[PDB]
């Protein structure tokens, strides 16, 4: 795999979003992978509804946070709608699908990356957007405005974000806090620093869609 991706170049990423005061980051990670796998599939870049899974994955708990790989598994068992046909409202409600018409995609399942392997993730990133966890707690992830982010962070994994690139010293991720966060919305976070956690935990857990 090469020194350097950013999936924001090859167009397979959409506009930063902002998730709001909604514990809904699971939803925002996964929909990233979800835009991130149909555009290397289909060459199309659409935009998918964060709403939709936040109303919809009976295994999460909406605002009150969840799983990016319940959300995952629930594309590829039924579908996801486009964001304009079920845009999001930071609040979950009733899961409205059957009331939107066909899903606008669909995937075939999701996988694991192995966890607490730089490597592994990295593999995963070079193929496609990666759902992947970190620590967003701490006080300095929360006030990042750039660089190369080393921490302070523990492991205490609360936050769901997406791998979309990496260089030689970082991994490339976008945030659901909206454009003025970060790089614009993104962060780097230094890697290959030999914790088999990952900087802030970020190899806890990591998903990735699978579309045939
Ligand atoms: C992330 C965000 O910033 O929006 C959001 O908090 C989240 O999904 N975090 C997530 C998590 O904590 N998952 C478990 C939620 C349990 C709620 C329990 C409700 C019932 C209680 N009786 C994980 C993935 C990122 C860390």
Do not use: M
Not at 107 to 124: H, I, K, M, W
Not at 175 to 193: D, H, L, P, Q
Not at 195 to 208: A, Q, R
């Amino acid at each position: 795999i090469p020194e350097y991706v950013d999936w924001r170049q090859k167009g397979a990423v959409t506009p930063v979003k902002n998730q709001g005061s909604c514990g809904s980051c699971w939803a925002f990670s996964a929909v990233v992978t979800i835009e991130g796998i149909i555009k290397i599939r289909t060459g199309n870049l659409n935009e998918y509804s964060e709403q939709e899974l936040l109303d919809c994955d009976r295994r999460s708990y909406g605002c009150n946070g969840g799983y990016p790989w319940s959300a995952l598994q629930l594309v590829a068992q039924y579908g996801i709608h486009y964001r304009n046909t079920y845009p999001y409202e930071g609040v979950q409600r009733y899961c409205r699908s059957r009331e939107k018409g066909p899903y606008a995609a669909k995937t075939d399942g999701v996988r694991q990356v192995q966890p607490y392997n730089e490597g592994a993730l990295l593999y995963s990133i070079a193929n496609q957007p990666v759902s992947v966890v970190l620590e967003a707690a701490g006080k300095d992830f929360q006030l990042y405005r750039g660089g190369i982010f080393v921490g302070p962070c523990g492991n205490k994994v609360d936050h769901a974000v997406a791998a979309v690139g990496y260089g030689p010293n970082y991994i490339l991720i976008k945030n659901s806090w909206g454009t003025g966060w970060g790089e614009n919305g993104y962060i780097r976070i230094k890697r290959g620093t030999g914790n088999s956690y990952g900087v802030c935990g970020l190899y806890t857990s990591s998903f990735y869609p699978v579309k045939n």
